[PDB]
Amino acid sequence: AQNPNCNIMIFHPTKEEFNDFDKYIAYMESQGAHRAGLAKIIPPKEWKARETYDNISEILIATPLQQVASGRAGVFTQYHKKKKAMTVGEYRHLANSKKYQTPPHQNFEDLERKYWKNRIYNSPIYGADISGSLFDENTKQWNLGHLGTIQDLLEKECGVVIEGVNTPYLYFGMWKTTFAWHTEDMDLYSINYLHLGEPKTWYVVPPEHGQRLERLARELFPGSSRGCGAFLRHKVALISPTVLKENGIPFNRITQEAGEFMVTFPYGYHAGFNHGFNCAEAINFATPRWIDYGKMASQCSCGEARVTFSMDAFVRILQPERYDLWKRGQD
Numbered sequence: 001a002q003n004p005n006c007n008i009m010i011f012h013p014t015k016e017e018f019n020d021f022d023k024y025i026a027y028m029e030s031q032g033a034h035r036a037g038l039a040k041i042i043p044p045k046e047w048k049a050r051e052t053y054d055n056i057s058e059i060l061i062a063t064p065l066q067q068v069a070s071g072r073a074g075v076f077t078q079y080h081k082k083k084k085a086m087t088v089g090e091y092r093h094l095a096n097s098k099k100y101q102t103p104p105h106q107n108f109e110d111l112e113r114k115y116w117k118n119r120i121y122n123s124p125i126y127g128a129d130i131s132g133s134l135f136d137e138n139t140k141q142w143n144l145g146h147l148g149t150i151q152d153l154l155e156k157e158c159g160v161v162i163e164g165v166n167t168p169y170l171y172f173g174m175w176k177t178t179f180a181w182h183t184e185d186m187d188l189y190s191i192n193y194l195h196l197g198e199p200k201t202w203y204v205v206p207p208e209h210g211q212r213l214e215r216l217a218r219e220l221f222p223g224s225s226r227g228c229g230a231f232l233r234h235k236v237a238l239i240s241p242t243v244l245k246e247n248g249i250p251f252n253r254i255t256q257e258a259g260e261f262m263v264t265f266p267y268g269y270h271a272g273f274n275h276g277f278n279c280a281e282a283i284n285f286a287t288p289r290w291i292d293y294g295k296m297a298s299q300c301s302c303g304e305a306r307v308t309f310s311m312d313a314f315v316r317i318l319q320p321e322r323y324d325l326w327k328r329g330q331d
């Protein structure tokens, strides 16, 4: 078995190997990359996402989210308070202000320590989940707006044609902005490209061990667990590496830098934080190997998780018994 310790793997494809996205994902899985739940892909030196980022300041963040925490430093939830719209140039200036800027630090490890010590005492503002793309239309390789759609994959594998579309999302971050522990909708893959700015630190649980994280979460968030049988779908819970180690939960960590891709694999729980002002682009995707994960994915029916238009068909086709109850949740 390849990668039996489930380590995060880092790949350096050549420009020739960067041509065929599907083939490269399958290659990474032949080497055991998926067992970690997360992989890093460093693009060939010849590649670029676009020519410059000098002209992005007028993108609008219609609904910036202030991420307010409750709990203790290693075990907390966050809720998202909606703020007034602002441009990316306005948000960048805010991120760099004395109130929000990254503190002085020695290295990524010192910064990580400071994040876990102090995150709960601040409420950073995240420009998350903005439909759009920063890839140039002429970028032919690993262009996250030009990937094979999940609807087309389902149709190719299973023969059924379904409604829905699959487009990317932009994330503008600042110091301490946080992504809570989650897997993707319908336990899909994700791919995330850090276009510019400061790094993003990731934590990940191997898919084969995801239920250990879920059992810890039920213990640590007992009211939330009574409310919903899949409450990590709400994407609000944080658990620190120290707490994971104390409870024996297998995980790994890695820091993504500008210019790098990360891939999350089906049922790979992940969480993390931004180091400072940055911009990432991410999208879900599927492969043939996903279908069995999609059929088994948990679902939130309590009503809280509320998701995209395209999830309907995935539930309806892959999970027809659950369909009815899940759709009650969504309506």
Ligand SMILES: O=C(O)CNC(=O)C(=O)O
Residues within 6 Å of the ligand: 128, 171, 178, 179, 190, 191, 192, 264, 270, 280, 282, 283
């Ligand atoms: O970058 C973020 O805030 C969150 N990203 C992801 O969970 C992802 O790409 O799958």
Ligand SMILES: [Mg+2]
Residues within 6 Å of the ligand: 055, 056, 057, 058, 059
């Ligand atoms: Mg602009």
Ligand code: NI
Residues within 6 Å of the ligand: 182, 183, 184, 190, 264, 270
């Ligand atoms: Ni994700």
Ligand SMILES: [Zn+2]
Residues within 6 Å of the ligand: 227, 228, 229, 230, 231, 233, 234, 300, 301, 302, 303, 304, 305
């Ligand atoms: Zn729920």
